[PDB]
């Protein structure tokens, strides 16, 4: 009947006429994401130096402390806190909240909730638009990777100080320390993931080139070929069967996608399932399952070890390992 | 002690409630949202 | 490189933005 | 700035140290033509480990 | 490379979640016949959604 | 007594192999289930007899 | 002094994103 | 090794038994 | 079976063809339960064939024998295995039971009735009969409540369960007077999952474990009776979806939750997953290395209360952020670890210096050394140690394997829940096949998006 | 400092309750399609 | 090791874990045999 | 909270509350102080909890003063379980000697302006001479970082490069106090201990304490700062 206050608020929230859809997953996604955005921007601008390692030496991380855009990074929570929940209200003051790594753990918790509700909001808008609902499933792969690097790896290793720092050189630091400790390069799940981005780029170039190579002539040479398409037209704007013929006599006549829906399913599923596999690889290496270990596999008849490519990889790994936490180790085994 | 803290880390408090005012405001906010949701019913 | 870098970045902001603004204002003038 | 301030480290300086560790621990076995018979006391490391 | 893998996944997902019916069957792959002059998916619905 | 246990268990092994290769074959055979009722009944019966026999002989062996 | 320029460049990109979202050329649907 | 030979005969007997069921159902009438 | 023409479902979605075929659906389920029981029995027999008694069970790649030994079968004081026969019994019983279940599944899948409502109306159901579906749900809650009370009976009257907190280093114990206090039981449930709290992973005594099982068994039986004797209320009807795919999606979300929590139990918990059987936990190994080197550097004539590290924060002992005395080094991140060989050495201020000096025990120090050498770090070739080590130790912890695989399964099952929640919603809505192409909702809305 | 915790608890509880009762308010009936 | 009565049955114990993987592969075999209808 | 009921509480009842960082408070006994029996004593479990942290600064108009700080670290500031032996005389003269225990605790504070002040709050090697109302003495203050500490550019005394290798041409002249010379010189402190609320029945003492000690000198990069620490203390005799 549409008179009540909850009715007005509810139809406003589920309204598909808003410039940006809000929805019920949006009533969580919007405040969590603005919280994470505000804290991330303020921390990237002027966060005081954060003690990542727990050993009374901080990493600066903020632009106002002499960092450029490549170096600047929201530094993770302290190693002393571990997986303990560390809100602002739990800290004695904002200043030591900052020094122990509070902004990071805040931004990561809000980013988790924001991407989860972004996925829910994607499903919701597809439901309200009569769509099919699996764009949320396709988006679950970058969400899986984000959870794997920001929360699942800290749970497996025992501290948010092992999470990815929110920055560029901090990300590179995470990758190098991670390979040093777990050998991600020789992990089959990371191999599938690398194949996923390489394939996503390959089939993106392939799909774009085959569609652009078959666009039907509608405009003149002095106009953009894009002007041959008008938004909302029902005609097919390219020659799908001709692109099939070209692809077939280029690679395999019979092993070519003769269905456009098959082609788009492969386009959707290949990088998504591979990012699922690499996100799960990061999760497996959170619980220390690690990559392939072929260090001193090959030996001669005398039993003397022959170095191999995996052994050169291992020497690089020892180089990476003896530099991460240059002063935080008291014991030889890296069980932390 | 050199300062004052809420010192509620650990100890496993229900919903992280260290003073009962937090539980009362959780109860109040869910209760009033349920109240508006209930008075605005018999609709659609 | 503290002020030479600033003038390099300043010119990189201005010249392509100005060229793009030429072209866009020219387009939007003609409907 | 890091050279003139013994307290200023960033993830950038951490990456530089990691890179140097890679170079010194990788060179002897990766570039055998250089015959780098480096003693283990000059290889840069962290603590313990 | 990351944006291209994103483009691959997001384009495939968008096309297959904006498909037109042409159905009478729960499998959608058999609703496509490649000698037709009509689009299979709603570019309008996709544009509105994104 | 362990010899009887091994003989009965090996018999159970062959009987279970015959059930594996035969029960789906008999069931999905076109109108073969009705005239193989005696065979399936005897096979399951001797299978259970062997199971409980091996179970008892485990106590004596 | 470099930090001023970095903040300018970053919020400039943010302003470009704001304008490209809320001040776009609408789809004409004709 | 006797144990190895029994392991391989058990493996071959099991691996054959599945497609043996399918082949016997394919040649013995149908309803598969 | 059916084909694409008669159902619209391709072969790679063939099980959807049996969504509305109750008898074949039942057959698929019974055959599947036959597979689960079959794997349990077959892998149990494989493990007891490949079990070795002079080694602990975490060194031989075992995942089911630790589970049986936690119930108090074949192990005595110290967690030492005394009889592999109970494990043999469980394996063979499961294998025979799987034969029976597999016959039931094959029968009901191949020659069983196609739909059960025309001949057996008690088992006959359609996905919209909410009364019948809640009856089935109620029957299954009584079944699961009897399972939980079966564990309660095992702990109370049938030999007890293995207690790693028993004095001396762990022993099987008859649980007497399990905690029945609702405050204590549900405080675990409403607890935060972060450090020091850990949600319900931080359950640390079989008293709490068995009491929660009494509690959950009684709730399951009561809710089962309630579901048999009720129907969902109109708010539940207006909020939920009532398709079989929807019920599947609800189950998928719940079991994905269960898989994630199982991963965290296997990784952190040491009272339901004793380290004598599963190997040390992640915190356990690092705290063990710190504790061992602490006692060696007491034996080499040095004061550990003093002697700050290269950062001046303490080589062996330091202060946690909450004020107690903890082990120094990076293992400070695991300062909230609780195990049977640290609690007798822990005072109100955390670790007590005089107790660390005088009240050491030989069993604690060898347990700590063995946990130090067998840390849950290994490669997927089963090469123990960090990724920079040598192929010399063939060991990966069962905690690692279980937490790894069950996080993978919990994540993929969450994704399956996404897929099925979406497909159930769009199927109840009507556009599971696509847009109408003539009544497209997007063309009926205002411009400017 | 406790005040900030009380206010944030109010914020989170309010938004979570809004989410919960928004989905409880007959969401599977807000499809655009027939039925 | 299995009890002293069941020691010669260890080889046919050793192959039993892989049987569910054989079951999913058998489902694919049957679908290939019915021509993937 | 006394030593009695603190030991009556288990580890699970104290964890996460901050009771473990707080020295025992005595309510029994008399504040008469002088009624302790004189003689040679051997104290065990010397405990000291600070209640204030202030740092001497340089005001730009020319003033020298201590201004309050904000504690960067969490509850890691007290010292507990320190042994020793003292001599108390009938005329009131005491000496104080501390030998073992957790006799140091690293602590970082902010001066207003967001400058980090790390220091190693120690009481080690304390030899305080005086009366029972107040006795004062000197204590050893170690540097902060050990010789094996590596700075951001490597370096350090035992382990390190001793030169900025990050630029292959500038490795001499002005940066002597950054790379060419590293200093781990231990400092010296000054503390004034007062005794109040003595329990002579069970042989325990308490009161307040005062201390001035150097902050982190680090490697010679900056001049050290001087920290004025006030707080309570506790000690059991025999
Ligand atoms: C609100 C919910 C927030 C959930 C995410 C926040 C991180 C939770 C966490 O810190 O996780 C860890 C906790 C376990 O907490 C640990 O709990 C432990 C309890 O064990 C203690 O007690 C034990 C008793 O035997 C032992 O003695 C042990 O040694 C001792 O330490 C300790 O307290 C640790 O400090 C503590 O960190 O897991 C748990 O509580 C179980 C929670 C479910 C697991 C979820 C995993 C996947 C999560 C998200 C995936 C998202 C998917 C969708 C998007 C994609
Ligand atoms: C396209 C078409 C479709 C594609 C399908 C692809 C599906 C699968 C493809 C992978 C094929 C698997 C490789 C087979 C070889 C193998 O496996 O070989 C391994 C073993 C057999 O080798 C034995 O492996 C043993 C492993 O050590 C174990 O036992 C040791 C005893 O010393 C130690 O105790 C050690 O701790 C313990 O781990 C020992 O090394 C033995 O010496 C060795 O003979 O097979 C086994 O275990 C059996 C396998 C069981 C593991 C799988 C289930 C558990 C899943 C965990 C997920 C975790 C992580 C995911 C990835 C990351
Ligand atoms: C847990 C695995 C599992 C289970 C229990 C089932 C069960 C079922 N499927 Mg299915 N399927 C599966 C996996 C599974 N499937 C997978 C992975 C795929 C993708 C390849 C398919 C694709 C698929 C399709 C396309 C179809 C089914 C169909 C069916 C149903 C009838 C099959 C039939 O009668 O046709 C005949 C099958 C046979 C004659 C083969 C007989 C072989 C038997 C069953 C193997 C067991 C033998 C065993 C070793 C002996 C044990 C007996 C005793 C000793 C214990 C049935 C309930 C059909 C259906 O929907 O029904 C309407 C159908 O159309 N499935
Ligand atoms: C998920 C539960 C689970 C867990 C935690 C374990 C854990 C373990 N198993 Mg076990 N097992 C399981 C299930 C499980 N298993 C199942 C279902 C079977 C039946 C096939 C077996 C059969 C089995 C045997 C026969 C043996 C073990 C053994 C072991 C131990 C060593 C594992 C190893 O090193 O192998 C290697 C690790 C792998 C092979 C990981 C493979 C990675 C995934 C699974 C495959 C890749 C997927 C691909 C990329 C995606 C494709 C998608 C699509 C196209 C299909 C270890 C403790 C061994 C043991 O120690 O005995 C005591 C052993 O002999 N398992
Ligand atoms: C896993 C078994 C199971 C399942 C599948 C169900 C399923 C269902 N139950 Mg049910 N129930 C169960 C066990 C189960 N119940 C048991 C064991 C009991 C005995 C205690 C009950 C007692 C019960 C009652 C009294 C009612 C239901 C009702 C319902 C229906 C609607 C519930 C709902 O709205 O969803 C989800 C519910 C909510 C989102 C609101 C519940 C409030 C919270 C979530 C309860 C948990 C409290 C806890 C603090 C929350 C945080 C826990 C988390 C941190 C782990 C639904 C079909 C209702 C019904 O329709 O009657 C027929 C109803 O009246 N059940
Ligand atoms: C490849 C498939 C696969 C395999 C091989 C396994 C294997 C395993 N899983 Mg698992 N799981 C899987 C898939 C798989 N899972 C999937 C897809 C999910 C959803 C994401 C899960 C979710 C899951 C959870 C939540 C848990 C496991 C657990 C386990 C382990 C113990 C199994 C168990 O005892 O369960 C339970 C057995 C039953 C439910 C049957 C009832 C048994 C009765 C009630 C026992 C009563 C006996 C009583 C105590 C004795 C007294 C007798 C008398 C004297 C009274 C085991 C190694 C457990 C674990 O160890 O966590 C790591 C566990 O908690 N899994
Ligand atoms: C109890 C859980 C459960 C149940 C009952 C179902 C049931 C159903 N699903 Mg489903 N699904 C689930 C979980 C479940 N799913 C999970 C966890 C996922 C992962 C995201 C999916 C993803 C999925 C998709 C994409 C589809 C279904 C579909 C279907 C329907 C037809 C299934 C079929 O015949 O496919 C045939 C069986 C096969 C093709 C065999 C699959 C082979 C897999 C890929 C190999 C995996 C093995 C490998 C070793 C796993 C390792 C992973 C990692 C842990 C190492 C059916 C009603 C279809 C549908 O919606 O129909 C309406 C369909 O499109 N499901
Ligand atoms: C998708 C996949 C899901 C997979 C796994 C799910 C993970 C975990 C499942 C829940 C485990 C923890 C449940 C208890 C939660 C709790 O008690 O919080 C209580 C905690 C406690 O909060 C803290 O407690 C501390 C002591 O431990 C102190 O008291 C702190 O002061 C206090 O902040 O608060 C939180 O962590 C956040 C609560 C709000 C969460 C908002 C997100 C919810 C989103 C949707 C809910 C919809 C319905
Ligand atoms: C941290 C402390 C709080 C923790 C709360 C945990 C205990 C409660 C958890 C179980 C709640 C039962 C859920 C079933 C109803 C939810 C679905 C619904 O929407 O049910 C819909 C249904 C439609 O009739 O409603 C009904 O059946 C009516 C049944 C629900 C009645 C709710 C009353 C609870 C008391 C709160 C009201 C105070 C109200 C106003 C506050 C004013 C403040 C100024
Ligand atoms: C439906 C279907 C299907 C199927 C499924 C299933 C699942 C089945 C099954 C089944 C089953 C699940 C079965 C089982 C079985 C069992 C048996 C057959 C047994 C036995 C026994 C024995 C003989 C043993 C012996 C022994 C002992 C006692 C001890 C020592 C050792 C030994 C081994 C000697 C498929 C998928 C294909 C496809 C689709 C359709
Ligand atoms: C045994 C044991 C124990 C116990 C346990 C327990 C007792 C548990 C429980 C629990 C519980 C008691 C739970 C509950 C729950 C619930 C849930 C989990 C839910 C849900 C759902 C959802 C998610 C929803 C959604 C929605 C909404 C929001 C509304 C309606 C509609 C919809 C659907 C939309 C302990 C730990 C002590 C110890 C150890 C062992
Ligand atoms: Cl590093
Ligand atoms: Cl360490
Ligand atoms: Fe396309
Ligand atoms: Na180091």
Author numbering:
A (entry chain A): 9 to 344
B (entry chain W): 60 to 103
C (entry chain M): 3 to 33
D (entry chain D): 304 to 352
E (entry chain D): 204 to 253
F (entry chain Z): 1 to 61
G (entry chain T): 1 to 30
H (entry chain V): 2 to 33
Give passages from the manuscript:
From these four complexes, the photosystem II (PSII) complex catalyses light-driven water oxidation and provides the electrons used for carbon fixation. PSII is a homodimer with a molecular mass of ~500 kDa, each monomer contains cofactors such as chlorophylls (Chls), quinones, carotenoids, and lipids which are coordinated by at least 20 protein subunits. The eukaryotic reaction centre is a dimer surrounded by tightly bound monomeric light-harvesting complexes (LHCs) and trimeric LHCII complexes. In this work, PSII was isolated from the halotolerant green alga Dunaliella salina.
Initial classification of the dataset showed that approximately 20% of the particle population were in a stacked PSII configuration, containing two PSII dimers facing each other on their stromal side. The stacked PSII dataset refined to a 3.68 Å map after applying multibody refinement, with each dimer defined as a rigid body. Subsequently, the stacked particles were classified according to the higher quality PSII dimer, and two distinct populations of stacked PSII dimers were obtained, as observed for the unstacked PSII: one in the C2S2COMP conformation solved to 3.36 Å, and the other in the C2S2STR conformation solved to 3.84 Å. In both classes, the compact conformation exhibited the best fit for the second, lower resolution, PSII dimer. Roughly 20 Å separate the two stacked dimers in both classes, as previously shown. In several regions, this value decreases to approximately 10 Å, owing to PSII stromal loops in core subunits and LHCs protruding into the space between the two dimers. Both PSII dimers are shifted by approximately 20 Å relative to each other rather than being perfectly aligned. Altogether in the stacked PSII structure we do not observe any direct protein – protein interactions, this includes loops extending across the stromal gap, this contrasts with previous suggestions but can also stem from the absence of loosely associated PSII subunits (specifically PsbR). The rotation axis of C2S2COMP appears to be broad region containing the N-termini stromal loops of D2 and CP29 on one dimer, and the stromal loop connecting D2 helices IV and V, CP43 N-terminus, and the C-termini of CP43, CP47, and PsbI on the opposite dimer.
